[PDB]
Design an enzyme around this catalytic site. Sequence first.
Site, mmCIF file in Angstrom:
data_model
loop_
_atom_site.group_PDB
_atom_site.id
_atom_site.type_symbol
_atom_site.label_atom_id
_atom_site.label_comp_id
_atom_site.label_asym_id
_atom_site.label_seq_id
_atom_site.Cartn_x
_atom_site.Cartn_y
_atom_site.Cartn_z
ATOM 1 N N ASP A 259 25.897 24.896 63.658
ATOM 2 C CA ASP A 259 24.379 25.018 63.639
ATOM 3 C C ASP A 259 23.719 25.093 65.016
ATOM 4 O O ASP A 259 22.510 25.324 65.132
ATOM 5 C CB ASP A 259 23.756 23.795 62.952
ATOM 6 C CG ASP A 259 24.095 23.706 61.498
ATOM 7 O OD1 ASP A 259 24.397 24.722 60.822
ATOM 8 O OD2 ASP A 259 24.040 22.636 60.956
ATOM 9 N N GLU A 318 29.448 31.046 64.830
ATOM 10 C CA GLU A 318 30.815 30.685 64.609
ATOM 11 C C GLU A 318 31.635 30.878 65.868
ATOM 12 O O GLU A 318 31.250 31.630 66.778
ATOM 13 C CB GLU A 318 31.416 31.523 63.471
ATOM 14 C CG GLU A 318 30.580 31.389 62.237
ATOM 15 C CD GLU A 318 30.523 29.999 61.687
ATOM 16 O OE1 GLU A 318 31.509 29.208 61.786
ATOM 17 O OE2 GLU A 318 29.472 29.685 61.025
HETATM 18 N N1 LIG Z 1 19.310 16.026 64.767
HETATM 19 C C1 LIG Z 1 20.057 15.658 63.686
HETATM 20 N N2 LIG Z 1 20.577 14.403 63.411
HETATM 21 C C2 LIG Z 1 21.288 14.137 62.300
HETATM 22 N N3 LIG Z 1 21.592 15.125 61.367
HETATM 23 C C3 LIG Z 1 21.046 16.350 61.509
HETATM 24 C C4 LIG Z 1 20.299 16.727 62.649
HETATM 25 N N4 LIG Z 1 19.932 18.046 62.606
HETATM 26 C C5 LIG Z 1 20.478 18.451 61.427
HETATM 27 N N5 LIG Z 1 21.166 17.495 60.791
HETATM 28 C C6 LIG Z 1 21.896 17.460 59.523
HETATM 29 O O1 LIG Z 1 23.025 18.395 59.706
HETATM 30 C C7 LIG Z 1 23.470 18.740 58.347
HETATM 31 C C8 LIG Z 1 23.958 20.173 58.511
HETATM 32 S S1 LIG Z 1 24.549 20.907 56.953
HETATM 33 C C9 LIG Z 1 26.197 20.065 56.786
HETATM 34 C C10 LIG Z 1 26.086 18.946 55.751
HETATM 35 C C11 LIG Z 1 27.464 18.254 55.510
HETATM 36 N N6 LIG Z 1 28.148 17.806 56.767
HETATM 37 C C12 LIG Z 1 28.387 19.198 54.784
HETATM 38 O O2 LIG Z 1 29.308 19.856 55.381
HETATM 39 O O3 LIG Z 1 28.145 19.248 53.573
HETATM 40 C C13 LIG Z 1 22.209 18.664 57.451
HETATM 41 O O4 LIG Z 1 22.475 17.647 56.507
HETATM 42 C C14 LIG Z 1 21.136 18.267 58.488
HETATM 43 O O5 LIG Z 1 20.018 17.510 57.892
HETATM 44 C C1 LIG Z 2 21.136 25.807 58.512
HETATM 45 O O1 LIG Z 2 22.297 24.988 58.183
HETATM 46 C C2 LIG Z 2 23.163 25.729 57.456
HETATM 47 C C3 LIG Z 2 22.550 26.755 56.719
HETATM 48 C C4 LIG Z 2 23.287 27.620 55.932
HETATM 49 C C5 LIG Z 2 22.648 28.619 55.241
HETATM 50 C C6 LIG Z 2 23.085 28.764 53.813
HETATM 51 C C7 LIG Z 2 22.389 29.935 53.125
HETATM 52 O O2 LIG Z 2 23.431 30.845 52.769
HETATM 53 C C8 LIG Z 2 24.669 27.440 55.856
HETATM 54 C C9 LIG Z 2 25.297 26.390 56.602
HETATM 55 O O3 LIG Z 2 26.662 26.335 56.525
HETATM 56 C C10 LIG Z 2 27.087 27.697 56.229
HETATM 57 C C11 LIG Z 2 24.572 25.471 57.463
HETATM 58 O O4 LIG Z 2 25.218 24.348 58.232
#
Ligand SMILES: Nc1ncnc2c1ncn2[C@@H]1O[C@H](CSCC[C@H](N)C(=O)O)[C@@H](O)[C@H]1O
Ligand SMILES: COc1cc(/C=C/CO)cc(OC)c1O
Lengths: 354, 360
Positions: A259, A318
């Site tokens: 991200d 990525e």
């Molecule tokens: N500054 C920050 N501190 C803590 N978490 C954060 C953040 N910025 C984004 N995130 C968290 O980063 C996550 C990215 S999506 C990944 C979610 C989980 N690890 C999985 O793989 O299912 C989201 O839940 C988002 O709310």
């Molecule tokens: C913006 O955070 C994400 C968004 C998205 C967007 C999903 C909509 O297809 C996907 C992710 O993993 C692929 C993320 O960690």
Amino acid sequence: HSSDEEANLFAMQLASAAVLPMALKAAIELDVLEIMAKSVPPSGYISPAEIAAQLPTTNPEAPVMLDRVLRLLASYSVVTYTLRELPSGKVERLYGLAPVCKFLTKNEDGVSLAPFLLLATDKVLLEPWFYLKDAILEGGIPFNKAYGMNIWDYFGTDHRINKVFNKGMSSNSTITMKKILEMYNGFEGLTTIVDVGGGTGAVASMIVAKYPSINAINFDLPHVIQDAPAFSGVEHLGGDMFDGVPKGDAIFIKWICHDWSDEHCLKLLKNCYAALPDHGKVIVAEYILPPSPDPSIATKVVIHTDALMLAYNPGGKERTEKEFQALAMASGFRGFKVASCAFNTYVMEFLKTA
Amino acid sequence: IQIIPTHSSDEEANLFAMQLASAAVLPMALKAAIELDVLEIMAKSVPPSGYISPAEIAAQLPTTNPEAPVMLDRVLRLLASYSVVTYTLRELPSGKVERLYGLAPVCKFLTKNEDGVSLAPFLLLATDKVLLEPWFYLKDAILEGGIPFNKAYGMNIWDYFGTDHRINKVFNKGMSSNSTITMKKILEMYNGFEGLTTIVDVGGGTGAVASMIVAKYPSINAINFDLPHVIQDAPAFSGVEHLGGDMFDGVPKGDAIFIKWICHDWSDEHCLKLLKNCYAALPDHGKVIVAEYILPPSPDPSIATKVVIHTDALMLAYNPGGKERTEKEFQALAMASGFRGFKVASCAFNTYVMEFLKTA
Ligand SMILES: Nc1ncnc2c1ncn2[C@@H]1O[C@H](CSCC[C@H](N)C(=O)O)[C@@H](O)[C@H]1O
Ligand SMILES: COc1cc(/C=C/CO)cc(OC)c1O
Ligand SMILES: Nc1ncnc2c1ncn2[C@@H]1O[C@H](CSCC[C@H](N)C(=O)O)[C@@H](O)[C@H]1O
Ligand SMILES: COc1cc(/C=C/CO)cc(OC)c1O
């Protein structure tokens, strides 16, 4: 030639390519694939009228409109089909489940990737695409151009899309982590694990289920943690990872690095280094960018996700395995291990000592 | 042969579900590439190698954004994975590997040809915000009845285009560019316009097709007939008389009536009404010339079939009962409106040209 004919027809296919994910979205929202999975045996087929008879509709056109949607899904092998001739000499189609439907309907544990598809095709995440040309010309992030703030701030203001996103990620991670936990032994023997950016806590709940004596912390932004179900053995905690993360014997980050820019990943990774004991590690779960733009489905998933990050995230992208090594080295870690892989997700360890 | 479920087959099933989930990224990234003029810049700017770097493309954009090159690279990498563009790899000083890009064969129809047209305006139509919106109402149309477009906009598509000047223009140009390409090919092969005194293009749009017919046959009277909001805009082509109206009321008289991509916009009932109007507008030896896709026998995986079934799904989203039809169904419409003769005469780019003959 037949050559010009093929090029023209491919150009037309590309022009209308969004019909496929949107048709599939409608089929999932109508419960079609679930109705098919429960109404006929795994190798059987069902007519569109028999599916429609289980929807709460009196629309006389519901059977034919479902047939039209299922025929598009059949052409891409998302469902199977068989033909049945009619007394008129016309032919109709009966449809069944193809192997991809195992991941688009609930499994033995009641999870699938359907919530993830509902997230990906949500109107909220489609809108940034109309600002990609602007972001390329003017600088900036297409999402922020559409919404006036970064995506995570936006999710803190729109309760519907927050729940859609969190459930999309929880369901996708449950499926991937179930497979990784059958193969990867790197959580064994930890006293405490911290899931940084752990969302609603699905991964941390699965780690504690496997290893009931582990102390687990699920850490994320407070509009996510407020929706996290209680799970025995998991402590939910709100905060901002760029200010600091909770201490533990290891930190797990799944789909966090992709991200953020390299600079923001170094800030986060140094916060993790600071939070670990001398012999601690970061367990990084991410795709790995292949070396060329090959046509395989697995590579297309990664490159589609690279394109999503471009639309959505500030500096997210990525990376290759060497680029991950470079992030680990520059944040002070001394060892690097590629430990396991499941559904494109590689599990790397960034080891503070080697 | 039965494929036994395994770890390997489950990986591929899981990844295909993920690819489907995010499949809109392909046409939306190609839309951005076309709007940026990237494919035209590539076509005109090949070094003599035939491959160009993202930085060299960016250098030709109206931008000083220093992230433009890497942003372009990421877009082009997705396009190259789907064979929309080609690539080559070149090793950098640091040992990192850069991609350079070239046009793939599909780009012949995504950049202007000798006649200055392509299918690019068609793709901009198909991916326009206005036409993505009905897809959020597809489940509603199935459960309630009705049309997804009308649920999103509170009126039918043609009425809406009469209120929204930007999309009307985008639609009429998408159709005229596409039809120009297909019609050029049909006119090389199909002889059915020869010897006619008058041809009427019903739902002719801005009249590109009528103007092609008179260019080829300067002794023919050509009428372009469509809705007033379409006709108002239409170029004053030499030898074409534009006439506004509603075809379900009736159509202009002529020796033949041509209808391209009209029947697929409308229900069987609507089509019968239109084709009876055509029957009444023709002399005893007249014909309707119908240019449409034809549904294949099965939902096979070929690109040509997929195009017809994508278009069947577009008609379900947009149009009042529109749908694709098989050859037997077109025959049944011809017989039901009184025509005694039916033939499949020609085909170009998947568009068949059928004749509905008043007298067999
Ligand atoms: N500054 C920050 N501190 C803590 N978490 C954060 C953040 N910025 C984004 N995130 C968290 O980063 C996550 C990215 S999506 C990944 C979610 C989980 N690890 C999985 O793989 O299912 C989201 O839940 C988002 O709310
Ligand atoms: C913006 O955070 C994400 C968004 C998205 C967007 C999903 C909509 O297809 C996907 C992710 O993993 C692929 C993320 O960690
Ligand atoms: N009731 C009606 N009477 C006349 N034309 C109509 C109509 N309703 C819709 N149309 C027209 O039908 C056309 C459908 S699109 C196909 C356009 C053209 N024949 C081509 O193939 O390029 C549009 O131009 C639309 O305005
Ligand atoms: C509204 O009528 C049409 C819409 C569309 C929709 C184009 C956007 O993909 C296409 C057509 O020919 C394919 C039509 O006759």
